[PDB]
Automatic annotation (TrEMBL), chain B:
HAMAP family in the record: Ribosomal_eL13 (MF_00499)
Disordered as annotated region, ranges: 117-159, 183-203
Family: Belongs to the eukaryotic ribosomal protein eL13 family.
Name this polypeptide is given: 60S ribosomal protein L13
Annotated InterPro entries: Ribosomal_eL13 (IPR001380), Ribosomal_eL13_CS (IPR018256)
Pfam families assigned: Ribosomal_L13e
Organism, scientific name: Chaetomium thermophilum (strain DSM 1495 / CBS 144.50 / IMI 039719) (Thermochaetoides thermophila)
Origin superkingdom: Eukaryota
Polar residues composition-biased segments: 131-143
GO biological process, one term: translation
One GO CC annotation: cytosolic large ribosomal subunit
MF-aspect GO terms: RNA binding; structural constituent of ribosome
RNA sequence: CCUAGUAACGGCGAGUGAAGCGGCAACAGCUCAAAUUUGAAAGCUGGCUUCGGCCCGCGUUGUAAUUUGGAGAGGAUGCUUUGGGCGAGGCUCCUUCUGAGUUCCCUGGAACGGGACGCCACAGAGGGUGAGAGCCCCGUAUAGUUGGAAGCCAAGCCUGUGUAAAGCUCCUUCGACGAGUCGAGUAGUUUGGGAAUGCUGCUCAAAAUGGGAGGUAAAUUUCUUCUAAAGCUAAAUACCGGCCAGAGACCGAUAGCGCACAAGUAGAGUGAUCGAAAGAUGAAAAGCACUUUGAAAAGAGGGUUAAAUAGCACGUGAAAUUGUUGAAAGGGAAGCGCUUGUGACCAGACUUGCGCCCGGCGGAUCAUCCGGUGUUCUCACCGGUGCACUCCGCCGGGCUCAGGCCAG
RNA sequence: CGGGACCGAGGACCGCGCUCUGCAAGGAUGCUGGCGUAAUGGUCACCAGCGACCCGUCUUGAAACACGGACCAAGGAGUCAAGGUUUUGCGCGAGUGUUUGGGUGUAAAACCCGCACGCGUAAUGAAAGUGAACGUAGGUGAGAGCUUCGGCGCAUCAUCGACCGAUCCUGAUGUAUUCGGAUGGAUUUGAGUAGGAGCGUUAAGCCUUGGACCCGAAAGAUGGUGAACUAUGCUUGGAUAGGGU
RNA sequence: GACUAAUCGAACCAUCUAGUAGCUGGUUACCGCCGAAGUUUCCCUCAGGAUAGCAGUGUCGACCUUCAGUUUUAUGAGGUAAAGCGAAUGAACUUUAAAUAUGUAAGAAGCCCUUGUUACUUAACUGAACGUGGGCAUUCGAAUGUAUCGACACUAGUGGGCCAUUUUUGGUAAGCAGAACUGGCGAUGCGGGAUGAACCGAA
RNA sequence: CCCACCCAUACCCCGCCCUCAGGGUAGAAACGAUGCCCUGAGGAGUAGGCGGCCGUGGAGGUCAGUGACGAAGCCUAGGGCGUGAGCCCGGGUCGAACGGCCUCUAGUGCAGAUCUUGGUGGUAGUAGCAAAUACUUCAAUGAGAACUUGAAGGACCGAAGUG
RNA sequence: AUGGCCAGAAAGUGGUGUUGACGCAAUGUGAUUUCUGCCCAGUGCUCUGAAUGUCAAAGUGAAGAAAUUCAACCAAGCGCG
RNA sequence: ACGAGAUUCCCACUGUCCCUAUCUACUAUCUAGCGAAACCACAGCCAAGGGAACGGGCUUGGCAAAAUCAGCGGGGAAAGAAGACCCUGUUGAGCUUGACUCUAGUUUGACAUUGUGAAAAGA
RNA sequence: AAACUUUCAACAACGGAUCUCUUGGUUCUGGCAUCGAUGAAGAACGCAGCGAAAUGCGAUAAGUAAUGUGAAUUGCAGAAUUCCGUGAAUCAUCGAAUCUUUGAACGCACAUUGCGCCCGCCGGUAUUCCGGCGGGCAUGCCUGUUCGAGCGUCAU
């Protein structure tokens, strides 16, 4: 608004390689760390799993459905077996999933 | 990063006609629906999978059904655009799954189709009888025949005894080995050819 | 819309800058050339018609049917498909028509203002009428309601049926597909494509699983996508022109278009062109009868008006600048600041209040109690009781206090 | 112990005190007179005493010079858009953003809807690629607040460590015996991790690009109009006493 | 370089076009709170730049630690005045010691001891450095003052001007010219020097 | 050398304004708490920075706002408030609309630009109104006759003309 | 004259040109009288006189799987004479 | 010879002076009518002082009396003087040349237009 | 003392600010697709009882027809209208017409109201002369018709 400006107060006093035809869809691989892995489970089922009322079932998480292609390994996991389906996985993320007692399945 | 070095004021497009254009579009849609009644306002579309590795997780509506899909559904290609089915002669069926899905889509549409006779006094056997011509209908095929499950389900549950063993050596090692084999496919072939030539020479 | 100020281009860097995917709006698909109708040019312009046709011709150096790559042609095979004519009803556009105060009082020249009593309202949008009008008038809202024309959509209903044309399924086979074109070199230009772009000129100049593309040059071997050098097609999109219409936190006659007016006018320039200024009496002309002075313009009386302090110089009528009248100052500038004085002209303040003690009036909304009601639940209001040493006003006296200005 | 001047802020009591029936002790009362209106007071005009350069503007350090100003009325100059950045307010918060569009409407309003997408939630490298916990998310020294009074310690700062990517060196088990790259080191590096802080919007300041606070140059370019003046030429016409030699 | 319609070293008309200017002119109410500056350091100069310094608004952090254009004390520089040489010796002599201003230092955030290591150094476990532990709160170890803190963020002008005292370096026939500190002015009214950028008093 | 005296916006005491700082104020008899009460210090200012207020055109809400028994505007040696920009009232003129408060909004505030447009002064009843030889008498017309007409005179062009 | 000197964007275009060396075009000087200090050979003017010395595009040869690279040859002008 | 070309001198001649005087017409002047403009911060007596070599206004003095007319050319005003000159430019423009980059014209080569027969020399 | 100059006030002037008004601009939105050889846009010249312009119109000239409405127009003059109607009006609508000279502009020209050619009709004594009136006569190209040209190719 013009009535709040300073002019009204001052009235009276004045490298590397080139890549031709880059297609960004070739390089689409969003990543999620394992410390956010349980947030993809729906809230009621996640609280049941974390409380321990599901001792005979394991959650199967499809990262590509949630929009992720790579499972990275920042954080720690609870001691619950989880099946994770991913296009890519880091070595530490696989190591932590295996310690948690699940398995990383490769998909395309 | 301001691109104002041309005569930009000559080519400024404001959009004060946005509500008026929405009103005009809605009036045109109402006129088209009234002209097309009792047919739906749009055509039946197939389910296709989006290209590239970024978007192949998701399915959407395609342009038209293939000739192979129409043949497997038993709908002739000249009858199909006259009963509200879009036809695309360019698209092919490289795999059985999309073909089966679109054939089932066409069969569901054919089971729900009500076909009025060309002459009321002389019905044919391909036509819907008058006792079955009265039913509650739909007028939006994009709504009633949309994409029901566009992505895969993000969460399922299996028993702990059904947990897979996994690829031997680990998924990370499997990915590294796949990349290494793809990079060394030609060198190993050349080495094997040279070894075979040497064995043939000095057998 | 996003991709994206990204990939990329760029002296000495200022800068430049797409596309695929994805969401949406809108969606609609097709016609030729390359084939022998060959048991029948089956095609077509024009003329004359008795409207039945008949002629002059075009055309075989190819006019119809058939086919267009999604295919098709030939076969095989057995089922399906079709032509006309009515048409209820609906929609579009002009046309007839639509509610309620001019009720009473005051101000006013005039109510359309103020007050009272009403009424209409799917209408209280807007405008007019002698001042702010829902009900004075035009219109406004809503369903409809008179009369007319031309189209479109359409529930259904009558009939002909297969000479012929058309669709579906299978197949040994066949399956023509655009040349100075594509492409290459070179030059200019252009592009983000100054290694990967397009266009054009000159030179060379193709092919038959061929050819083009696959954004780093080349050879070899693969792969993936289409099918150029012929052609048609609605919608979503644009719109400082034209026509019709509705609006605005826009401007209010030096503003807003140059133009609210006989404005692209008057005027200027040989010409191309340049290009203004300029709105408002009053409700109604009622635009001053008549008398008188002047040659006249006009003046003075006297009417008109609500007002001429509105007289076609016209609503209001500021300043600069001028005239008259009144007051004042002035020995080579005035103006201004502080402070008196003189003269002229003014705003306040004050006019008496409150409280006691007597006397005279006029009334019982004195205290207590009873009932009802409300409240903040213990305080109040209303009705009865006061019977005048009690309350409330008024009038005469007296007294205390407080009251304006300047001073000792 | 006299004589004089200027002033009287405050507004129940409270306090410190004293010479203690009260007081000169945390700020003036008491008595009296005239007048009650232009008398006091005020405004204007003028005289008098004292005081007092003509305003911007420019320049440099400053003056002077220079430039503008006859007078009055009306316009008349830091604006809007896009993109940044910091700060303020607000909503939601590991998310956030309805408005391209669709639905709806009392119709450019308001209300409602959701796929995609943008930004954020992960970085590093030219790239292929790889990708963030030894530890109650570490130790030490401070540190508001809390504490059961032993300590716990926010934000933040300093320092030493740990993890991720890039660079260099070494090269384990294994093996398509030529691939793979574990383990262990060393330098820097990156606004990297180490118990998320962002997204949207409002307001203000500053930049950056546009005519960009307003008024001007000699210019440059595109397309038109002129030989009625004047210059030269062509065609066709007209005109110029009387003397001397 | 004449003339080409009062226009000619390139006519006139309209447009691009509101062309550009770093140069000139102008740039619109009031009050209140703060409030400036001229080689500091680097870059090839003029037709140059940044940058330090000085300012204002917001905040935040325990606005916590204290700090200071000052004196004193210890010790430097200035040993230079001076006293004596019945002290030695002879400004260059010294027991002692000037004036003006001036550097450094003056605590618990400190001092010292001890233990090891050293890749420093030393003949050297020797000094020094790095760690380790301990002792010293009995006074926290001069004076005076102390609404004077710190860190960010954003914003703005000025950043090789004039005059003067003192110190210093050069000069001229005489004028004078460079630096350093300080004060004043540009930005500032008042009293006095009759008058006034640079004087005195006082803001 | 000595005594007295004169006066600065400097110094001392007192009043008032503003700014800054430090305190008090709820089982609220309680407050534009954005208030009130107590105490102390301070006051120049260009470039520059910040805060608060005043004013103008328009918009939403509100004041059951003003107004033909006179809105707006204008004039005023008439007054009141404010440090100030300004605000309010009286008197006169006038004729149809306008204002206060809280928000919103901007084409929002002039002495200058050899501005822009329009209007008006002093100069000033001034400079001039002086090339081309020149006018005069009577009568008529008329409100009015040097510059109209008729007559009467006097002159000029002087045939490359004032034809 | 299949020419000179000009003009035009081009033209089956125009001019000089209804022209032809006693002509046309371009220069310098400027009536008459006077008048060409003496001699060259550096720059310049012009000689198709031999060379390939420099040497473009096209064309020719060699290598290579090709992109390409390397070689001679090489007009006018320059150079040499 | 010719010349509105530049220069020196001689005779004649004379108001060029010496040395000024006088006359005429039209103005100026006065009146009737008519009637501008330039310019204008405000104004107009001086002297000394007013550091920046400048005062009209300040300081200190001299002084100083309404309202006017004809002249006048010392200041003050007054020159399309915002001229001319000098200085500066991210200056503009005309002009010149072995300045740079280009270019019309001209010239040289090659490919195409471009055909039909011979003879000779090389493959 | 007056006059003069200046200051202050009242009234009167000068001038056109201020206020209020607005059949106008400006911007946005919505709808529509329609110029011309069947002669457009533009230009000129004319037309009313009394008009110069603006407006409307074209020698049928501020207009004709037709349809609708239903009593005006108005500045003056003159007439209305059988008002129980083929009907006023500077009315509205608009399907039928008129539409001068031009202009792409078309017989050739045009700085001329210049000069022609073809075919009809009428009038004046008129087979011959004169006059008037009507319809025609541009260019490029297409389809067709008809008349042609050329040893260009042939047959006879």
């Amino acid at each position: 608004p013009t009535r709040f400006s300073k002019t009204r107060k001052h009235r009276g006093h004045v490298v590397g390689m080139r890549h031709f035809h880059l297609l960004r869809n070739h390089y689409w691989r969003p990543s999620i760390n394992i410390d956010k892995l349980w947030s993809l489970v729906p809230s009621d089922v996640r609280e049941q799993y974390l409380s321990g009322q599901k001792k005979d079932t394991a959650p199967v998480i499809d990262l590509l459905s949630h929009g992720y292609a790579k499972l990275l390994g920042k954080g720690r996991l609870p001691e619950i077996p989880v099946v994770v389906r991913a296009r890519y996985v880091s070595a530490e993320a696989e190591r932590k999933v295996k310690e948690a007692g699940g398995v990383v399945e490769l998909v395309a | 990063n301001n691109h104002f070095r041309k005569h930009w004021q000559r080519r400024v497009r404001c959009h004060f006609d946005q509500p008026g254009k929405k009103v005009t579009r809605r009036l045109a849609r109402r006129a088209k629906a009234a002209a097309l009644a009792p047919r739906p306002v749009d055509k039946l579309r197939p389910i296709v999978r989006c290209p590239t590795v970024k978007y192949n997780r998701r399915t959407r509506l395609g342009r038209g059904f293939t000739l192979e899909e129409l043949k497997a559904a038993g709908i002739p290609r000249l009858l199909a655009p006259t009963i509200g089915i879009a036809v695309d002669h360019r698209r092919k069926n490289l795999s059985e799954e999309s073909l089966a899905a679109n054939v089932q889509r066409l069969k569901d549409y054919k089971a729900r189709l009500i076909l009025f006779p060309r002459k009321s006094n002389k019905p044919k056997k391909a036509d819907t009888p008058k006792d079955q011509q009265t039913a509650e209908t739909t007028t939006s095929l994009r709504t009633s025949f949309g994409v029901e499950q566009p992505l895969a389900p993000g969460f399922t549950e299996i028993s702990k005894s059904e947990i897979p063993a996994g690829i031997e050596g680990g998924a990370y090692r499997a990915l590294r080995k796949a990349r290494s084999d793809a990079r060394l496919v030609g060198v190993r072939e050349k080495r094997a050819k040279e070894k075979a030539e040497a064995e043939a020479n000095k057998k």
